[PDB]
């Protein structure tokens, strides 16, 4: 299943199947990519596909005990991995080869359940990403990473099931005008779930090319990526979440 | 400044009414059907 | 919206719609790049002015940004304000429109 | 040509005759053992008719 | 027979709760903000387009 | 005397308590898994992504949920019309969150009174007696086709059909006020008048009988008694009340025949919900009700308001507010 | 102030005219006039807050919604437990009771 | 529209397709003319 | 007294189109030079993206080159639709006539070996249809 | 009424008065051409730029005069006159493309803009202004 | 056969009535047509791109 | 947030304080919005007010448009709430 196998089905018989997600695999190794330090470089059709959702739970919570990441069950649908995630790559650092974040499906709102019926959702993404890599050559190893900030699950303009927003939406619990009515130390302070807060954090990822191709058809490698995962607007605290599968790239020259 | 279209819709109209009990009115009057 | 939103120069993939989902470009339940909305029930709908930008794995996302050639934003915007909506005295609307025009599909 | 157009014409005159007393004929107790090509005749020229009016829709 | 008073202290203390009944109150709150204009006119309800509650892009 | 026609004589035997005919091979394992699922998920189901968006609606009694508010709620708009069964899911439970409950009721639902209303015949075979209660029962069997299936098929999902429960279809009702304008639609405006027509009639014809009963009975005790059940003999006269209504409005208003009285009763309601069961179907295709807004306009073009401009400006503050952050785009659907 | 009629009322400042002149709105995006755009101050007379006049924005669009109740007055609602939506007078509960009784 | 030496016709086809509603109606005439035996 | 008027009379509320005729002239030319260079100038454009079909053979990706040619392209027998009809003399227009219909022949015989996966087939299909294309071109002017 | 139809001809304020016919000729002709995508002054397709009396001023020729709008609908332009929307928009240029612009004259494209400025005169609050003035 | 007549006594004069009310700026959709879109789907009288002459 | 101090340059004003506004609070505005201010919400003035006038990818008649309502945009701290919808911010008329 490489990118060569895939252009030749009709999208008659790859819509349905489940195939359309499936981060074609760009079988070879004993090979290299040279990065010129003077020519101009892309990353084009980053395909990224996770497996395995983990999430980090508490089992003791007072001492003498860690916090073993539970397997979960995914929730939503097969709608988890990324498309077409390009980026210049030509930047050096100092000979680390550092990629900047461009534009692509960077984002995908899934939701996992952990063991006990708590849905928790989270965005994973991979939104401002500058991954450095030491080294000039690209395949079997040169394991790349670096921070990616995730924007939080709603938006602003997400309005509540009480019509409470960030951007929009009211300003207090209107259902409840008898608790807005008091004048002292009772007048809807209560609730801060009505000033929503549109929080930025930051997550980390590394993965490794795990296979080459000295032509085009960058990794078919893997990756691991730590994360935090909704808020709820500034609601309830997040959890962490540990992401590991594979993804695949391809270098252009430029 | 006239009309002449809804005239002649409105004449045809009265043809057209003028068909289906002429052909009754006169077989009530002939004793057929 | 895809392509007047794109010629305000936004990256239209990475949306971050308002739900937290796709506001232009969505995945379907079977994976494919498809439209955000509302219209992610139709996502199964093969169109021959939009067939020219769907690839193997649903709409590409290089022939979305590039290929868009301006036929086909005539077939979009004549086919918006055609939509089969209309009332039984035959006003076009989304029924709380006011008449102006006679239209049913 | 407007000699097609009386021709026509013609017809829907003649039709509204037709439709008229084809079922008064038709369902009186008499007039139907007396006149058959009476009608046949009516039905002729309206057959005849459409005829001359098609192959002159040509010129 | 307005309000399950159980509900609202829920859907106040939760935003992720959310029920028919809930949507059916907002319903309502879009009926008595949009119409009151145009229904009670001696009122002289003069709301202006960005206090009424709206949805969103519609 | 055959292994197979001593099986197909207890199929179609009467002397059972329930008729368990030829129908009843498909309606009674229907309807009985349309009703597990729905005594389940109405007490223990978990919350559902109904539009797609990523925002569940907790609908059963576990998750608060008076039943004044509880659902089986509909399926994901994601999900749209396609088909969902439990083995088309990676686990039991994410069939759960795009709402999987509500197609595994409703088609078996429909493919049951489908087969109740051809059971309706059934009876009225073996028993020898004519047979058009199957006929009658088409006007709720239409419009329980009507709210479930063919208004999913016309508007898209199985997210707009009308939630398994009392306040789902209360939110049914004012969604598709906002955008179908259903008050305002002749067909509807027919069934209203067979069901405020047909609740008089009741109301009517169930007085002029009970209020003309013969005394076959004594002063005290309960008037029914006097009806020994079985009789050959009418209970009631029914030139006395002929001749009541006969007084009431006039004397050729009221049907001495009471076979023909009888079969008034049968057409008004029924032909009334046959055409409330097209109008919900034909605006499920978006053939909306009439649409009055800004018609009336004096001299220099100023629109003036009418009624039905006062109908609107409830029919916008239902459509702004109905599916509050579902919408990306300016047009509802369009 | 809000009417008897309704349940949820939007808090629009008027002058003597009739004209509004601020909305303390439910769109932030593109208001054209709010609390803190036309920065409307809050003088205090009589009661508790006699003399109190504060004009930050955020403490003026607190004692804004609460006067659009009619008057402001402190609650001591730690005692019958109070849930927050306003209850009838008996008043309104004979009226109730004798007019469908009747 | 229609060709040019039928279009003197357009007011006679406008109240063509509302003669299948009067063959409906016609049956009605003619049953109260016999007296509806 | 209320003006009414009965089956005609053209006020501002009369739905009738025997009065308000057109008065000026019909100021689109039905075919001038603007749009005729418009016409010239697609077939610049859809004579590259023929040309283009080539490379999605030979990498055997099916959905652009069954897509490629209904891209750009699709205002491509329009165009040719005007062209032929713009022309003076008459045995001339034939020579553009047959060549547009062998044309067209030509281009979906490439679709029918594009949605078989006959890599073999559409390549001679292109070839036959691209030398017709620039045989439209001296034909027309 | 309507006694005030003194709609501007082009810049520096000189007026043209518009008389009943050309006012019937003109709304019978923006419905069933236009009113499709602009039901009461709004753009369906691009709604932050429509037929408001103020956005239609703020435009790089200010369109609220009607010679400005006959050069829009023979020669349309973009909101700050760089490009040419004539691809996007129906227009007496681009009537091959649009086939509504093909049979309409000079002289009703003066009707149809007599009614783009008529609309705010009579109904100032609702034409331009979305649904929230219905 | 009375009333297959009428059946295409109907197709006879709704045809008749749609090509009467024609205008040929407008496409198929926008006038309620119903027949002339089956016959166009047949290739009569239809162009390229969509439009019929 | 529940209150936000800067929400009178976002629209409905003068000084449209161009790092979180909406694109089209640039409509009222001549010579302003179509692709003048794509300019000016992509590749963004994150620094200050006349960072806006040395920015890049203008042409010079452009960069004369924005010389003539200079004092019409301010330069705010950039809230993440609202960069998010500076494109679409679902608010169509
Ligand atoms: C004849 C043999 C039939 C065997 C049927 C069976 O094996 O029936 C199995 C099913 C239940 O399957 C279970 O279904 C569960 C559904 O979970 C959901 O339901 C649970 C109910 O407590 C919790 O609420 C949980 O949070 C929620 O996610 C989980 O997915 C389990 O993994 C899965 O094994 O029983 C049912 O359908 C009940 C049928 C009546
Ligand atoms: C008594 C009621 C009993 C009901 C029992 C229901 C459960 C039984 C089992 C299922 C029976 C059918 C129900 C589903 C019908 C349906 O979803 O029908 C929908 C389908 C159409 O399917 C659609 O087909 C479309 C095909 O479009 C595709 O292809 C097109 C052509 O290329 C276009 O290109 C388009 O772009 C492209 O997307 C899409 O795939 C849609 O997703 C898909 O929904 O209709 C069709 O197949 C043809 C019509 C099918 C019959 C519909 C009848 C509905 C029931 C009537 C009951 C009346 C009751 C009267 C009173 C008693
Ligand atoms: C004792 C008994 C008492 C009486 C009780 C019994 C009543 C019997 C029923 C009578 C109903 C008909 C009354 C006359 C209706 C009429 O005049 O109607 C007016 C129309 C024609 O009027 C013209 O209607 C036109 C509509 O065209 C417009 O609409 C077109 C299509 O929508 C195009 O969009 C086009 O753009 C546009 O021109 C224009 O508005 C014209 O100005 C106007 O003159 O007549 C028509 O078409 C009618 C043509 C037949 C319609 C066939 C059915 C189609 C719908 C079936 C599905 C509906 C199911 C739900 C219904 C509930
Ligand atoms: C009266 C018997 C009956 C009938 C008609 C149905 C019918 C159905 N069940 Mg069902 N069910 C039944 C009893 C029945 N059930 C019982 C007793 C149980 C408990 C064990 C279940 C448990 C059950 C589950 C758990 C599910 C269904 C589902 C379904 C649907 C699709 C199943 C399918 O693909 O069938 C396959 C059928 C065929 C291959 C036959 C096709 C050819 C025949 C001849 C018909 C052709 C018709 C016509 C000619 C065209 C369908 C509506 C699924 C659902 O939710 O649907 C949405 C689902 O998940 N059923
Ligand atoms: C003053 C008393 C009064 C009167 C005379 C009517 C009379 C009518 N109503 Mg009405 N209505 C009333 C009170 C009244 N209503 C009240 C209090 C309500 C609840 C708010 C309604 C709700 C209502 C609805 C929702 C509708 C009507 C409709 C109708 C019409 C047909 C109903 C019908 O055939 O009934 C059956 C009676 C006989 C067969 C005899 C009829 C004109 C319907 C309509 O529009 O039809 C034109 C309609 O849609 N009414
Ligand atoms: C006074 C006002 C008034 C009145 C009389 C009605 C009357 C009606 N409305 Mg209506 N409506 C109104 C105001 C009104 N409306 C307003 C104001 C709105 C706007 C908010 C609406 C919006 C509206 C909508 C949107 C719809 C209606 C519909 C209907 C019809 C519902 C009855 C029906 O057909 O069910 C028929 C019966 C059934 C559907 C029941 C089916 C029964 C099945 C076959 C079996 C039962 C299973 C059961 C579980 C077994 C029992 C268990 C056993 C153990 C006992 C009826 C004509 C509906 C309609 O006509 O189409 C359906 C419809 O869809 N209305
Ligand atoms: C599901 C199908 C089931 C059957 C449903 C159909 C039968 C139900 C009855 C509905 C039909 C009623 C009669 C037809 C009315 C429309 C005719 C019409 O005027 O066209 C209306 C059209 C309007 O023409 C319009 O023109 C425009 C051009 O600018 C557009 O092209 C429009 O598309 C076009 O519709 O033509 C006419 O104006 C003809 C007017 C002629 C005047 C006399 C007509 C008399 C007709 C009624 C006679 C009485 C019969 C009524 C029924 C009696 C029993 C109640
Ligand atoms: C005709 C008589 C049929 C038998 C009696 C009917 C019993 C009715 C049972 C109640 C309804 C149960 C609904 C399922 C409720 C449901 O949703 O179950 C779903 C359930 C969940 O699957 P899981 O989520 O565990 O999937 C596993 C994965 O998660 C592992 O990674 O699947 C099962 O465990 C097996 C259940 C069916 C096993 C059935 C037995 C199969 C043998 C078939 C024999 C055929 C011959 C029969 C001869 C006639
Ligand atoms: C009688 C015909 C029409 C008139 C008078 C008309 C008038 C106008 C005017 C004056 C503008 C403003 C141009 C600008 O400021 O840059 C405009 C914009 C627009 N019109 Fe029309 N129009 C007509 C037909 C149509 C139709 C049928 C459509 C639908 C396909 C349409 C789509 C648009 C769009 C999309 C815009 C916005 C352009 C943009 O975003 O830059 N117009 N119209
Ligand atoms: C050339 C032309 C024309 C003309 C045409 C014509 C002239 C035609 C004729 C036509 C006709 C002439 C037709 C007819 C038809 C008829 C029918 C189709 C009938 C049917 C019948 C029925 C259906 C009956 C029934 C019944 C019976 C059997 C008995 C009793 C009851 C009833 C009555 C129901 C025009 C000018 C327009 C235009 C142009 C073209
Ligand atoms: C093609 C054409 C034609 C033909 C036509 C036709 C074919 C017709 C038919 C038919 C018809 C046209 C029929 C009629 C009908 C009539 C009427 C007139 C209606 C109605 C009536 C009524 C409705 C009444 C009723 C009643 C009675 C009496 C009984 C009971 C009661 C009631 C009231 C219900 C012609 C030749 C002219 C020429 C031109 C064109
Ligand atoms: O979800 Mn139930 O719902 Ca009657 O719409 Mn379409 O999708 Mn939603 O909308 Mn507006
Ligand atoms: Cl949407
Ligand atoms: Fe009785």
């Known amino acids: 299943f490489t990118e060569e196998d895939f252009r030749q089905l009709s999208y008659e018989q790859v819509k349905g199947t489940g195939l359309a997600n499936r981060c074609p695999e760009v079988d070879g190794t004993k090979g290299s990519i040279k990065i010129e330090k003077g020519k101009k470089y892309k990353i084009v059709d980053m395909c990224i596909e996770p497996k395995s959702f983990q999430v980090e739970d508490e089992v003791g919570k007072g001492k003498q005990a860690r916090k073993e990441f539970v397997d979960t069950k995914l929730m939503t649908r097969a709608t988890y991995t990324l498309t077409g995630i390009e980026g210049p790559l030509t930047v050096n650092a100092n000979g680390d080869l550092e990629f900047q974040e461009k534009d692509g499906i960077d984002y995908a709102a899934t939701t996992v359940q952990l063991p006990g019926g708590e849905r928790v959702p989270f965005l994973f993404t991979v939104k401002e990403l500058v991954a450095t890599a030491k080294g000039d050559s690209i395949g079997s190893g040169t394991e790349f990473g670096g921070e990616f900030t995730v924007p939080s699950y709603r938006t602003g303009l997400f309005l509540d099931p009480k019509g409470r927003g960030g951007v929009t939406g009211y300003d207090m619990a209107v259902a409840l005008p008898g608790m807005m009515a008091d004048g002292a130390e009772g007048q809807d302070e209560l609730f801060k779930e009505t000033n929503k807060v549109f929080q930025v954090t930051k997550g980390e990822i590394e993965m490794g090319v795990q296979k080459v191709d000295p032509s085009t058809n960058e990794i078919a490698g893997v990756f691991v990526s730590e994360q935090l995962t909704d808020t709820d607007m500034g609601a309830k605290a997040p959890k962490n979440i540990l992401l590991k599968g594979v993804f695949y790239a391809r270098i252009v020259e430029e | 400044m006239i009309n002449w279209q809804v005239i002649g819709q409105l004449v045809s109209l009265a043809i057209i009414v003028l068909v289906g009990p002429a052909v009754i009115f006169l077989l009530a009057f002939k004793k057929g059907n | 919206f895809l392509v007047r939103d794109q010629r305000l120069g936004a990256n239209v993939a990475s949306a971050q719609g308002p739900t937290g989902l796709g506001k232009y470009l969505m995945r379907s339940p079977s994976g494919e790049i498809i439209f955000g909305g509302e219209t992610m029930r139709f996502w199964d709908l093969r169109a021959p002015w939009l067939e020219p930008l769907r690839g193997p794995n649903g709409l590409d996302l290089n022939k979305i940004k590039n290929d868009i050639q301006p036929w086909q934003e005539r077939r979009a915007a004549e086919y918006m304000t055609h939509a089969p909506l209309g009332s039984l005295n035959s006003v076009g609307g989304v029924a709380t429109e006011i008449n102006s025009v006679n239209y049913v599909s | 040509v407007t000699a097609l157009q009386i021709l026509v014409f013609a017809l829907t005159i003649l039709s509204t005759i037709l439709v008229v007393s084809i079922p008064v004929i038709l369902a009186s107790p008499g007039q139907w053992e007396q006149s058959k090509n009476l009608v046949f005749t009516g039905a002729g020229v309206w057959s005849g008719l459409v005829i001359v009016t098609g192959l002159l829709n040509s010129f | 027979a307005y309000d399950f008073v159980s509900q609202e202290l829920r859907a106040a203390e939760d935003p992720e709760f959310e029920t028919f009944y809930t949507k059916n109150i907002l319903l309502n709150e879009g009926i008595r903000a949009w119409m009151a204009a145009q229904d009670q006119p001696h009122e002289n309800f003069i709301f202006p387009e960005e206090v009424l509650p709206r949805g969103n892009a519609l | 005397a055959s292994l197979w026609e001593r099986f197909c004589s207890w199929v179609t035997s009467t002397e059972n308590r329930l008729y368990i005919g030829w129908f009843g091979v498909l309606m009674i394992p229907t309807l009985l898994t349309a009703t597990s699922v729905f005594i389940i998920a109405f007490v223990a189901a978990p919350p559902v992504d109904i539009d797609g968006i990523r925002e569940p609606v907790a609908g059963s009694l576990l998750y608060g949920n008076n039943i004044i508010s509880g659902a089986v709620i509909p399926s994901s708009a994601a999900i749209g019309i396609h088909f969902y069964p439990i083995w088309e899911a990676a686990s039991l439970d994410e069939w759960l969150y795009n709402g999987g409950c509500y197609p595994l009721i409703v088609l078996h639902f429909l493919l049951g009174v489908a087969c109740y209303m051809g059971r309706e015949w059934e009876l009225s075979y073996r028993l020898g007696m004519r047979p058009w209660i199957a006929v009658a029962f088409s006007a709720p069997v239409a419009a329980a086709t009507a709210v479930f299936l063919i208004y999913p098929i016309g508007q898209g999902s199985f997210s707009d059909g009308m939630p398994l429960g009392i306040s789902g279809t209360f939110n049914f009702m004012i969604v598709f006020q906002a955008e179908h304008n259903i008050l305002m639609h002749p067909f509807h405006q027919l069934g209203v008048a067979g069901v405020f027509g047909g609740s008089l009639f009741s109301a009517m014809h169930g007085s002029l009988v009970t209020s003309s009963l013969i005394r076959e009975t004594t002063e005290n005790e309960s008037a029914n008694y006097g009806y020994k059940f079985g009789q050959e003999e009418e209970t009631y006269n029914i030139v006395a009340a002929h001749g009541y209504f006969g007084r009431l409005i006039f004397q050729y208003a009221s049907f001495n025949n009471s076979r023909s009285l009888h079969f008034f009763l049968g057409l008004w309601p029924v032909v009334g919900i046959w055409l409330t069961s097209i109008s919900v179907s034909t605006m499920a295709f978006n053939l909306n009700g009439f649409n009055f807004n800004q018609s009336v306009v004096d001299s220099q073009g100023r629109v003036i308001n009418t009624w039905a401009d006062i109908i609107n400006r409830a029919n916008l503050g239902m459509e702004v507010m109905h599916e509050r952050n579902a919408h990306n785009f300016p047009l509802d659907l369009a | ?102 | 529209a229609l060709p040019e030496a039928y279009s003197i016709f357009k007011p006679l086809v406008d109240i063509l397709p509302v003669i299948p509603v009067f063959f409906l109606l016609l049956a009605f005439v003619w049953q109260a003319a016999i007296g509806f035996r | 007294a209320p003006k009414q008027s009965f089956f005609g009379g053209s006020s501002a509320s009369s739905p009738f189109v025997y009065n308000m005729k057109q008065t000026g002239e019909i100021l689109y030319k039905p075919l001038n030079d603007e749009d005729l260079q418009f016409h010239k100038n697609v077939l610049e454009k859809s004579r590259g993206e023929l040309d283009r079909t080539s490379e999605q053979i030979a990498r055997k990706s099916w959905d652009d080159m069954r897509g490629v040619i209904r891209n750009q392209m699709y205002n491509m027998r329009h165009s040719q639709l005007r062209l032929i009809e713009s022309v003076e003399s008459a045995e001339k227009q034939k020579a553009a006539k047959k060549n547009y219909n062998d044309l067209k022949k030509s281009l979906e015989e490439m679709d029918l070996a594009a949605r078989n996966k006959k890599q073999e087939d559409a390549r001679k299909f292109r070839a036959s249809a691209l030398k017709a294309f620039d045989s439209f071109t001296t034909s027309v002017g | 009424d309507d006694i005030t139809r003194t709609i501007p001809l082009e810049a520096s304020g000189t007026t043209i008065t518009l008389t009943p016919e050309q006012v019937k000729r003109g709304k019978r002709l923006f419905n069933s051409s236009c009113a499709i995508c602009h039901n009461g002054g709004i753009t369906k397709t691009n709604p932050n730029v429509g037929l408001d009396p103020e956005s239609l001023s703020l435009a790089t020729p200010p369109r609220d005069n009607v010679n400005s709008l006959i050069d829009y609908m023979k020669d349309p332009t973009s909101y700050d006159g760089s490009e040419s929307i004539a691809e996007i928009h129906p227009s007496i240029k681009s009537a091959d493309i649009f086939p509504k612009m093909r049979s309409l004259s000079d002289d009703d494209l003066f009707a149809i803009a007599g009614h783009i400025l008529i609309q705010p005169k009579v109904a100032s609050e609702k034409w331009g202004g979305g649904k929230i003035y219905y | 056969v009375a009333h297959a007549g009428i059946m295409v006594f109907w197709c006879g004069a709704m045809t008749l009535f749609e090509v009467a009310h024609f205008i040929p700026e407008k496409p198929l959709y926008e006038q309620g047509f119903i027949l002339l879109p089956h016959l166009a789907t047949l290739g009569w009288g239809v162009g390229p791109g969509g439009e019929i002459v | 947030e529940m209150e936000y101090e800067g929400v009178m340059y976002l629209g409905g004003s003068d000084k449209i304080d161009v790092n979180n506004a909406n694109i089209r609070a640039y409509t009222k505005y001549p010579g302003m919005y179509p692709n003048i201010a794509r300019e000016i919400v992509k590749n963004g003035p994150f620094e200050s007010v006349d960072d806006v006038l040395k920015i890049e990818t203008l042409t010079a008649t452009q960069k004369s448009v924005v010389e003539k309502y200079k004092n019409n945009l301010i330069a705010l701290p950039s809230r993440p709430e609202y960069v998010i919808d500076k494109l679409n911010n679902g608010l169509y008329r």
């Open chain 7, 1 to 102: 102030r809000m009417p008897a009629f309704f349940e949820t009322f939007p808090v629009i400042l008027v002058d003597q005219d009739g004209i509004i002149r601020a909305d303390i709105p439910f769109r932030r995006a593109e208001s054209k006039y709010s609390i803190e755009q036309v920065g409307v101050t809050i003088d205090f007379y009589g009661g508790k807050l006699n003399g109190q006049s504060f004009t930050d924005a955020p403490t003026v669009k607190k004692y804004a919604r609460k006067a659009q109740l009619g008057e402001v007055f402190e609650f001591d609602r730690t005692t019958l437990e109070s849930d927050g939506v306003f209850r009838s007078s008996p008043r309104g509960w004979y009226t109730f009771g004798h007019a469908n009784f009747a």
